[PDB]
Amino acid sequence: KQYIISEELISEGKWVKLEKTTYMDPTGKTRTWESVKRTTRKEQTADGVAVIPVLQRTLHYECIVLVKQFRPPMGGYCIEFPAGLIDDGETPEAAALRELEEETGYKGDIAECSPAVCMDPGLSNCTIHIVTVTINGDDAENARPKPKPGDGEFVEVISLPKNDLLQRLDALVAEEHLTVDARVYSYALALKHAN
Amino acid sequence: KQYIISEELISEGKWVKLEKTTYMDPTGKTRTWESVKRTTRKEQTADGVAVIPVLQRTLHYECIVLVKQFRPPMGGYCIEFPAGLIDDGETPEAAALRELEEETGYKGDIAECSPAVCMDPGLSNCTIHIVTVTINGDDAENARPKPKDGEFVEVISLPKNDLLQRLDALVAEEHLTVDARVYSYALALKHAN
Ligand SMILES: Cn1c(=O)c2c(nc(N3CCNCC3)n2Cc2nnc(-c3ccc(Cl)c(Cl)c3)o2)n(C)c1=O
Ligand SMILES: Cn1c(=O)c2c(nc(N3CCNCC3)n2Cc2nnc(-c3ccc(Cl)c(Cl)c3)o2)n(C)c1=O
């Protein structure tokens, strides 16, 4: 049984905080850790959601819908699962379908919803729900989606075949320099590893 | 189309720092962002590595070797891929094999090495390698390893063909959380069947 002993504020910004965390190990020694925390969430099951969108069309391979967007901390573009903070009072499933439509224009159905999972455990306390969402690419709504992005949001949609995800990801990075998100790569990696 | 303009320090810690980032959007408008950066080092292909350890035995289905460890920012224990910063001058492959060994006691072989991938693009510039490592669980060495040292890491081996449900089982406990990359991997294992 290891414990949080105390949490010291080091600096507060609007969106994110830097804290000094004092905890103690099974030996009984007090140690410290520099933790990052979002000031964004309070009461909820998690900060946000990540959406795994599976574009399903008859007589076709399933596509995985990914987004491409500039990330200021990375100082460059990244390939990611559609994601965003859960609003106040919203279910993970609802935030998932909302975010997906906002960024890609696709309207999907909930397939499954994960427990809250750590985004960056060794550095921060951000948790998310990973929501798998199927998209009927044959239904009339999804024939041609329309993104409804916010002010600061410029999002490009990228669909890659599920049956060949890992190599298509490597292909994109060959054509230009962008960085695949770790959750996306892990997903792609397991697809080839399975069986 | 979007570019970094300037990045000014807001507070610097011993390992990790907080910066404010100024950039320009495609329209030409100037915006800002609060970025987290490790002060630890820039020489590498990436900040660290995550190891996907595949326990291979002739009489069993492959296990995935995971670790359970207390994470102060989470204020609780987390189930993760063996991971750690890459030392300086060390290859991703070497750090992977080193880290896997330190945490689990297993000695493995490199299967494949990924490109640098972002840990948390909307918050930080941390990049890592996902290095796939096979473990000969039939070999005498690995009969049952002992994890080499300063911290406290519990080893958990779970069947690959049944990873996700075994993960959901463990995580229902009080402060035990599955890492997002671990869960994404497990999700894909199940979607693929
Ligand atoms: C911010 N910070 C540290 O980053 C730190 C730390 N204490 C330590 N260590 C841990 C290793 N032994 C010496 C002590 N470290 C290094 C470390 N531990 N875990 C990772 C890791 C895990 C996953 C990934 Cl993907 C990456 Cl890139 C890094 O980094 N303290 C006290 C701290 O505030
Ligand atoms: C630290 N920080 C922000 O977190 C921030 C931010 N500006 C904003 N917004 C963007 C949305 N519209 C209004 C402004 N946000 C909110 C936000 N943007 N992206 C996520 C997100 C992405 C992925 C995941 Cl997995 C999660 Cl859990 C969260 O959160 N600025 C300037 C900032 O420094």
Author numbering:
A (entry chain B): 14 to 208
B (entry chain A): 14 to 161, 164 to 208
Question: What does the published report state?
Answer:
Two predominant substrates have been identified for NUDT5: 8-oxo-dGDP and adenosine 5′diphosphoribose (ADPR). NUDT5 (and NUDT9) catalyze the breakdown of ADPR to ribose-5-phosphate (R5P) and adenosine 5′-monophosphate (AMP), which permits recovery of NAD+ pools after DNA damage and poly(ADPR) polymerase (PARP) activation. In addition, NUDT5 was recently shown to be responsible for the production of PAR-mediated nuclear ATP and, thus, subsequent ATP-dependent chromatin remodeling and gene regulation following progestin or estrogen stimulation in breast cancer cells. Distinct from MTH1, NUDT5 had negligible activity against all tested oxidized and canonical nucleoside diphosphate and triphosphate species but catalyzed efficient turnover of ADPR.
Of the evaluated inhibitors, compounds 25 (TH5423, MG assay IC50 = 54 nM), 26 (TH5424, MG assay IC50 = 39 nM) and 28 (TH5427, MG assay IC50 = 29 nM) showed the most stabilization of NUDT5 in cell lysates. ITDRFCETSA illustrated that TH5427 was the most potent stabilizer under the described conditions with an apparent EC50 of 2.1 µM. A crystal structure was obtained with TH5427 in the active site of NUDT5. TH5427 bound in a similar fashion to TH1713, with the same primary coordinating interactions. The theophylline moiety is anchored in place by stacking interactions between Trp28 (chain A) and Trp46 (chain B) and two hydrogen bonds are observed between the theophyline carbonyl oxygen atoms and the amide nitrogen of Glu47 (chain B) and the guanidinyl group of Arg51 (chain A). As expected, the piperazine moiety extended out from the active site while the dichlorobenzene tail extended deep into a hydrophobic pocket in a static position. Overall, the orientations of TH1713 and TH5427 were very similar and the additional functionality at the tail and 8-positions did not cause drastic changes in the binding modality. Of particular interest, TH5427 had no effect on NUDT9-mediated hydrolysis of ADPR, indicating discrimination amongst ADP-ribose hydrolases. Ensuing dose-response analysis for MTH1 gave an IC50 of 20 µM (cf. 29 nM for NUDT5), which results in an apparent 690-fold selectivity for NUDT5 over MTH1 in vitro. However, in combination with progestin stimulation, TH5427 blocked nuclear ATP synthesis, impaired hormone-induced chromatin remodeling, and disrupted progestin-dependent gene regulation and proliferation in T47D breast cancer cells.
